[PDB]
Amino acid sequence: FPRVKNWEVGSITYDTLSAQAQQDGPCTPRRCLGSLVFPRKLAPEQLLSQARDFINQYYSSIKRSGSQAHEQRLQEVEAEVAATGTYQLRESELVFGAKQAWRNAPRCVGRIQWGKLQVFDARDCRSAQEMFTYICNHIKYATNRGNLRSAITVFPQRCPGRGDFRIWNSQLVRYAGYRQQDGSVRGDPANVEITELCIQHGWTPGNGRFDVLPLLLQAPDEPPELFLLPPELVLEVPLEHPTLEWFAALGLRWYALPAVSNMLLEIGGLEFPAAPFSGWYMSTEIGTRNLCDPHRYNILEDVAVCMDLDTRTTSSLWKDKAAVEINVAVLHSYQLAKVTIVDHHAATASFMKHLENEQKARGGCPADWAWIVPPISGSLTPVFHQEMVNYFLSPAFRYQPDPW
């Protein structure tokens, strides 16, 4: 059992939960591959094994392991797979599995919220227009006029033979990325590719660097089709700085709802290639990574010139100064627009609290240091000085190949 120390306080804990980590990660005794974004790469006998495991801790959670429907629920799954090859989850199980998968996400710093998740059951949807309506209900419910609420919508489980439901965008809200004469990009460079696929599927392109892309939604086998998002459903926050008057004039915006729509949900060995989840932003995500990454909007320099900073020498720390103000603008703007957002200090402090809860509850917590520590001011947050153990638990969210 790995010994884990916190270097700020000097406290020691042991991660006993790691002992039940199965689906092996990328690392070996000879080399650590912890920093890698995608680890490695992306007879029904196996299905039952994962199913019994999932059902077993469901009843552990609600006390009733031993006797009662715990007994009973086990055979139905057994019978259901024997008869049909796959099985269907009880609604409560779907709910429990969805929360568990979020609980188990090593890279998520917001997991103190894992208990508060609204699960929409969309396993009875069988059309692209149906998905779109399901997505739109989600977006509307999750956005909630700016008082954001964590939400996941779960579409039908993958079946052997015949295709899958699948959202082609990485998120429900993504901004356009347009190539050009110089091969450079107006808009978001992260989304240039899906922008490419949007246009070659019949989407009329747009103005500039903040065009909300359409959804490319895909029902089984029958190839994808475009769906335009209602403007009133897509909540956005124009970016202003509380004291730097010119910041507004930079014309920056970001959307309200971070909703990830390309990850595969695994509960009890069943796979949901379409299960979009949503929460609310940590401000560094927008202010530091989206706006300031060299390969994203890359605005750092432009903001520095406006602040009349000395960009002639790295040792003026002009990047650092401009980054902080871009972050200050994000927090101020979202607060002004009354849109739920959390700063990286508050978020990491809550995660520390989440660590201690999980220590008592499960004897440890899978955490990926490199993704939990914020992208600015890392050592000024408590998680920096906290050792972590990273491993895979089920239920879980996994990456998956893209539909092309």
The tokens for 147 are 């008082």
Is 371 annotated to bind a ligand? Reply is yes
Decide whether 93 or 285 has the Cβ nearer to ligand W69: 285
Q: Which residues in the chain are immediately followed by a break of C to N over 2.5 Å? A: 42
Binders of ligand HEM among 273-302, rule CB under 6 A?
277, 279-280, 282, 285, 289
Whether residue 351 contacts residue 372, with contact meaning beta carbons closer than 8 Å, is answered with yes
Give the binding-site size for its own copies (rule: CB under 8 A). Answer: 69
Residues 357/350, Cβ–Cβ less than 8 Å: no
Active centre residues (catalytic): 108, 111, 280, 285
Alpha-carbon torsion angle 263, 173, 213, 211, nearest 10: -150
Map residues 283-312 to x or -, x wherever contact with ligand W69 holds by CB under 6 A: --x---------------------------
The answer to whether residues 384 and 371 touch, using CB atoms and an 8 Å cutoff, is no
Binding mask 20-59 for ligand H4B (x = CB under 6 A): ---------------x-x----------------------
Q: And the tokens for 382?
A: 């408590």
Q: Could you say whether residue 40 binds ligand W69 (CB under 6 A)?
A: no
Contact 258, 278 (CB under 8 A): yes
How far apart are CB 404 and its own copies at their closest, in Å? 18
Question: Could you give the string, one character per residue 51-90, with x where binding to its own copies holds by CB under 8 A and - elsewhere?
Answer: ----------------------------------------
Is 168 near ligand W69 (CB under 6 A)?
no
| Side chain identity at residue 170, one-letter code | S
Stretch that binds Zn ion, among 33-41, 131-139, 204-212, 379-387 (CB under 5 A): 33-41
Q: How many CA atoms lie within 13 A of 132 on its CB side?
A: 16
Q: Which among 6-14, 115-123, 206-214, 266-274 is the span making contact with its own copies, rule CB under 8 A?
A: 6-14
Single out the residue of 1, 7, 246, 399 in contact with ligand H4B (rule: CB under 6 A).
Answer: 7
Are the C-beta atoms of residues 125 and 132 closer than 8 Å to each other?
no
Minimum distance, C-beta of residue 8 to ligand HEM, in the bound complex (Å): 14
Q: With binding defined as CB under 6 A, does residue 227 bind ligand H4B? A: no
Return the C-alpha torsion angle 297, 298, 301, 306, nearest 10: 10
280 is in an annotated binding site: yes
Task: Determine the straight-line distance between the first and last CA of the chain, rounded to whole angstroms.
Answer: 42
Give CA–CA dist 313/317, Å, rounded.
8
CA–CA distance, 72 with 81 (Å, rounded to integer): 15
Are residues 212 and 255 in contact, defined by beta-carbon separation less than 8 angstroms? yes
- Write down the least CB distance from residue 46 to ligand HEM, Å: 23
Specify binding-site residues for heme b.
108, 399
Q: Binding site for Zn(2+): residue ranges?
A: 27, 32
Would you tell me which residues interact with ligand HEM (CB under 6 A)?
A: 102, 105, 107-110, 113, 117, 150, 152, 277, 279-280, 282, 285, 289, 342, 347, 371, 397
Q: Which residues of the shown chain bind ligand H4B in the complex (CB under 6 A)? A: 7, 35, 37, 370-371, 384-387
